[PDB]
């Protein structure tokens, strides 16, 4: 009798406690991070926000890099602005790209990025999120370019900081983090962007530094990962800014064992690029410095490539399925599904996962996000921002199209 | 002692459970929907938007159909739009109906539809949605005419797809789906809009098709259905936009056995239509292509008809209680109920109902919405939207009126 | 064992589905309203929003009788708006009062009223609304002039209707209803404005009308009551727009039996009236006809008057404690305390009540709210709106100022 | 058994009435208040909110006045503003500081300050805030300069009101008060600004006034007290608006027993102020007339003061450790992180801290917000506004820089 109504007891303070963290909107169980892959045959679209078409008349921020990062509960499009709204002069893109006013703010998916509507995650013009079940984590990293901190913030609480050990741009994903059994997991980087940088693997638990490790990554170059837990490990793909025209990966354990290479596909995934032909296991310098921020999904030997269509500049969309791209060299793939067309303004890309404790699968979802950049350099405007557009990865029939940004530049404020 | 003790452990841990899934919003319990309609004498207002008028100023969608569905805690317009707001020249509608910028998107019933207050449900140019008493299921197709895909989502994430079976503008309700005992029920079509195409019904259990039939239904037309439970099956009234002026009608068990016809009444319900006059139990040819979204509702063999006033255009909307009307071919009615008056403008319109899980009632409430169209073709603008009202049913004194949409056009952006 | 074990076991699904209705806001615990008023010595300032200032530039609705309701965990105004915006050609006045665009809304208390935070209420151009402790009931009157209907909502969800019984304007309250366990309490009238017209008070429980009586009040008149619960009978105090300058009154137990008069003293509450002089306990026909809104709290037979400053137009108000003025012909006061300044615009005024159960006083605190009305006909401007100020009453220091709304007029929509 | 079947009834019913305050949003336990300011090394940047960027097109309140308080669940930034938005011409800021348009108001931390995310707090030019655990303490000050009233209210209910007793404008804080173990405590000042005034220290539980004393402060002036919670007692740094330019603070114990001084280094804290050069422990006369909301975090016999980089106006900040700087009069310190840089818009700041309920930690964190002040007097603009960024202290790695507002005036409304 004492012992079941002392068991009674701890249940219903035990579960009171977690009823009242679950109303403030905080988790009661770390995601697992434990299954693989799902099985898929395409992409289906889930989401598009016309930002910048709805910005022409709303109040919209003028944004850049909208990657996409889930709780148990609900998905959300972080973002990066200046501070600005589209159609005010403020919006002016003379200001330097590190900026004192740049900031990282989310809002639901698929919501123009309003004033009205996001939420202020950190001050930050690089920037990191994630959840792990129980709280966002995100990291925004300020400063100046000699010794940059990344500001580590778990529940919006101050939990961390990391600051810049080489003093040239410490810089991170700007895509989400991969969260792994209550712990997190995230690649900065701090040097050259045009040589051998130094790349290192962070592992967070709470908000805090709990490990971390410098890549020895000889000859390669690493940057703004996207990085997806797959089987308890943590797989990223990166931008190879100096010499690689396919992208660099590191993939490691949750004690940070790690291994690197490169994408082998001929079918190249960054850009700019050289045309498809025999690619390599290494770096591809052909066109290779520069770059843009994108993703892969490694299937076995096989991989799902997001890449531009154009070689040359951040134009159209396509998803590329290579079932020996991983580890091969030839540049032959066996479906393609179109995303943007070729003629359209693209941009960066990342993944995002869905977990099984949010799905109901009992494997890990893959999704992607495209950003759609508009404006200058390519238009003559004196603002730049992205909208953005997302994918799910699914087991059914899908279809390829053109979803492109669709807003008419110039605008009111460019006259 | 064992026995009572372990019983309340399964009853917190349980109902704990189910309280943090509330909290998220997520229902405990599927809707029955095995009442059978409210005994009704008449119609009361339940909302009006204003869209349009406030949108003159305030940041507003350009919008298309904004229908109503329920969950068991609130109701919400569901509506398409562009990603364009009004006074906005992103709203000239030059653009495609079936464009890669539609998005279905919603609010809260009567709230003008701003970015600021709507929350995003899909990317679509045809859509659908309803609650089970769990979750939100939503349905947007979009895509090539010629493969369109339609996403399933189930609480906002992906469960399903279902592709175009024919290559020609898959396309389903523009109202809400009907739920009965935890499955959804909807209706598409696939290939041509001014001949024999197909028809679908689809069962739906968490956002996964279960089973789907098509319609024997040679010589009838289905589109744009409006579909209600009632008694445990669910009945759909539907626009002929082939050659019928009377709107056809399919029944269907939770088997997806059915049953199919055309509404007899001699007041005919499409737009355009002939003057009343002795009908058919099939499709009335006289003005009979082209077509509105409509509905009715089935008391017995008698019928509650909502439709335009005009026989030729969309003005007006009235509400007509024909107690012989479901089966029998004259043209006489017994109740007339006004709600918008002849020279206003009036167009697209749809059932939903309220479950007794939500109301406390014993019974299926029936209810309706009207889309008020301003702008294009009729008028010198350059684009097109939609304000709404909608009526609940109910068996107690109403009153008949003109509650229209009471924009003035040209808007600004309009020269 | 068995007893106490299933004793937990209806606690715990009883709590459990509280709970859950809780967490979608409805409350579990009626408000008992048997509470006498709390003894005060003035009046706190409680709220003011600015809504005209801020809509100035801001996208503000054009409202009037924004009037103040509470549940047990909030405050919000409530207001009618014709769904249109400040500074946009739709607010232009020529529009009938009682329109079909007309709309019953409301907001956080001290926020200005915008369609971004402002929910939808109900379709009216005449409205009351009032907290049970579990739900909020609304009252919405649309229609004919020659048959107008009230739509009765409990959560949202209509419930009743009540049609006009004579066919000449049913109108209502226009401030908050009043509750005492459980059932809720109005008054409406139908008939003439200036002439004898017919009263009903009307008893409501869970948005049903449970019971109704027609007030016998030859030679009174009676519009736009204020009503509050007193010690679980409810007081309303009216305004006489026939013959009466000086305010009416009805109070009632919840079986509504009532008893009726007019406040005697010389202070004397409508506008217009006549200057201070001796009263009357029936109708002073002096300046009698027409009116203005208002309210006044009954403390034995002292009252507290709230009026306008000025006898001929809605300008200024203050407060007056006139220790014997409910029973007493004298206008001889003991406190006044200013509110807004005799060359400030002023307007409607209604009481509202916060109960013990949200205050956690052991008596019932009084409130009010004024309507400071700018615009046409006194300003020249196409447009009328009101901004609202509102106060409680403590018994602890206070002050008397004058904080009227403070907008500059005309507006850019009026050139 | 029927001890431990009623002992688990007391537990649900009480667990069962917290959840549903709690949904609410009401917590369950009062903050402590007892620990000690951790040990940080520097300062990790918080939040910045770009108002006035945001503002030159969304719709953004002209604010003073920034400053942040937190919950055990979230943080706000509370301010004042004359309901008036940027780039209106109501904005114009010859209306009075203390006007009947002033408000207090508050919206989530790093948010543009908006009619459409911000929440209302009190009428109020004057003005404190903070959080017990259980719910807000608002202090809203009102009224004529010779009588002006603090309206009290906690969880938005007013509870209580403090009136002037010397009837020369009665003014509080700026920043938040301090609360320990349900007691919370602030400091107001009636009298002269330009002399000898009086300053009363409150005790305020769950609204009420519990205690106040009047302070002994011959040749002292205390202003816009700058409060936080240490150890179980209070810490106040304030403003002497009359002769010292270096900060006067006030601490006390829970029964209002309190010491009094000058913070004695060389590093003068208030603006104006001479160049550094030995100090006093009383109040150094240079300069020392008016004066600016500030704040520093004693430790030990050291201090970290902010203060801005000029010596005679609002430009730049700057933390500084000073490890002896409480209680000796040199001008040399330790550390010093930028904050904003000299040639850029400062002004007010206060402290705020982040209690161990809510971070976690064993300790009381040290938090700061800065407000940058843009317009007149220094600007040709017709507007004043602030816009806030904040900091934390952390013991990890952080840099300086500076953050400052970055809007481009004039603004549109100023031509
Ligand atoms: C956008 O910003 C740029 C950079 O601030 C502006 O060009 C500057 O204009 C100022 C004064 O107008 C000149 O004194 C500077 O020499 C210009 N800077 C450079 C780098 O050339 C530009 O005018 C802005 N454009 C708009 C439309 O606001
Ligand atoms: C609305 O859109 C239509 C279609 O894009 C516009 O008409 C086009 O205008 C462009 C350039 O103005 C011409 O080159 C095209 O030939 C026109 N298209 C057609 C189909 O005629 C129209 O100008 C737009 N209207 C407004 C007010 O923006
Ligand atoms: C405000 O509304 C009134 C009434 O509709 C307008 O006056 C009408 O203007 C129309 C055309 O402008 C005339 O044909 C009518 O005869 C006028 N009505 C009356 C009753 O005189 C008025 O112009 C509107 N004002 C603004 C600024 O929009
Ligand atoms: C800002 O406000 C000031 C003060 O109200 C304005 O200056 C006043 O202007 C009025 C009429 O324009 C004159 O009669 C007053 O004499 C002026 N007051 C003072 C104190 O000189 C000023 O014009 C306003 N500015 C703007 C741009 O609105
Ligand atoms: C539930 O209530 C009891 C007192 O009746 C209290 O001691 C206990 O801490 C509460 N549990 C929680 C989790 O708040
Ligand atoms: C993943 O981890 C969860 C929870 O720790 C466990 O229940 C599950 O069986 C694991 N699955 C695999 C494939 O390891
Ligand atoms: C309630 O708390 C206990 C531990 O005290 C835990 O094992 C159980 O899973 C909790 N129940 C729920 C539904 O979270
Ligand atoms: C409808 O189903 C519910 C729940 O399954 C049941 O309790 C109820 O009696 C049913 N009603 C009818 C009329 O079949
Ligand atoms: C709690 O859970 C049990 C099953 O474990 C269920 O029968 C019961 O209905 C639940 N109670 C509530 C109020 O939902
Ligand atoms: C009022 O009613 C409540 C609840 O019904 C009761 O507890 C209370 O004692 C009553 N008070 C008076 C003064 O009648
Ligand atoms: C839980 O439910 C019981 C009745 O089943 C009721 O008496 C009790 O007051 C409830 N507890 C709370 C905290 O509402
Ligand atoms: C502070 O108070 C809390 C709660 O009253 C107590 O548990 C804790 O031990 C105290 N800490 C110190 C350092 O006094
Ligand atoms: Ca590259
Ligand atoms: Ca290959
Ligand atoms: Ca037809
Ligand atoms: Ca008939
Ligand atoms: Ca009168
Ligand atoms: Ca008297
Ligand atoms: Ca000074
Ligand atoms: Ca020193």
Chains 1, 2, 3, 4 share one sequence.
């Not at 991969?178 to 040589?195: E, I, K, L, R, Y």
């Not at 995934?269 to 520069?290: E, F, H, L, M």
Request: with cysteine; glycine share 10%.
């Amino acid at each position: 009798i004492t012992l079941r109504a002392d068991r009674l007891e701890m249940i219903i303070n035990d579960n009171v406690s977690t009823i009242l963290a679950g109303g403030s909107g905080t988790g009661s169980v770390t995601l697992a991070g434990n299954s693989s892959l799902c099985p898929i045959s395409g992409w289906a679209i889930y989401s598009k926000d016309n930002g910048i078409r709805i910005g022409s008349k709303g109040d919209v921020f003028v944004i850049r890099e909208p990657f996409i990062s889930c709780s148990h509960l609900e998905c959300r499009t972080f973002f990066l602005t200046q501070g600005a709204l589209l159609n005010d002069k403020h919006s002016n893109g003379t200001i330097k790209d590190r900026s004192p006013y740049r900031t990282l703010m989310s809002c639901p998916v698929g919501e123009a990025p309003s004033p009205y509507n996001s939420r202020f995650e950190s001050v930050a013009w690089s920037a990191s999120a994630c959840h792990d079940g129980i709280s966002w984590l995100t990291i925004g990293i300020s400063g100046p370019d000699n010794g940059a901190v990344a500001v580590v913030k778990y529940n919006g609480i101050i939990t961390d900081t990391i600051k810049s050990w080489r003093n040239n741009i410490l810089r991170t994903q700007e895509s989400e983090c991969a969260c792994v059994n209550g712990s997190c997991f995230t690649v900065m980087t701090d040097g050259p962007s045009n040589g051998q940088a130094s790349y290192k693997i962070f592992k967070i638990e709470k908000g805090k530094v709990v490990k971390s490790v410098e890549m020895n990554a000889p000859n390669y170059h690493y940057e703004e990962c996207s990085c997806y837990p797959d089987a308890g490990d943590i797989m990223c793909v990166c931008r190879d800014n100096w010499h690689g025209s396919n992208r660099p990966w590191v993939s490691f354990n949750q004690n940070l064992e790690y291994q690197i290479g490169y994408i082998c596909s001929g079918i190249f995934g960054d850009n700019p690029r050289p045309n498809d032909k025999t690619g390599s296991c290494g770096p591809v310098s052909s066109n290779g410095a520069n770059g843009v921020k994108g993703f892969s999904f490694k299937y076995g030997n096989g991989v799902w490539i997001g890449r531009t269509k154009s070689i040359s500049s951040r134009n159209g969309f396509e998803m590329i399925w290579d079932p020996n791209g991983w580890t091969e060299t030839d540049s032959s793939f066996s479906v393609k599904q179109d995303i943007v067309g070729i003629n359209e303004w693209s941009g960066y890309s990342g993944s995002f996962v869905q977990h099984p404790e949010m799905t109901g699968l009992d494997c890990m979802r893959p999704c992607f996000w495209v950003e759609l950049i508009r404006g200058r350099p390519k238009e003559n405007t004196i603002w730049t921002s992205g909208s953005s557009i997302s994918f799910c990865g699914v087991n059914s029939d899908t279809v390829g199209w053109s979803w492109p940004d669709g807003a008419e530049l110039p605008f009111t404020i460019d006259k």
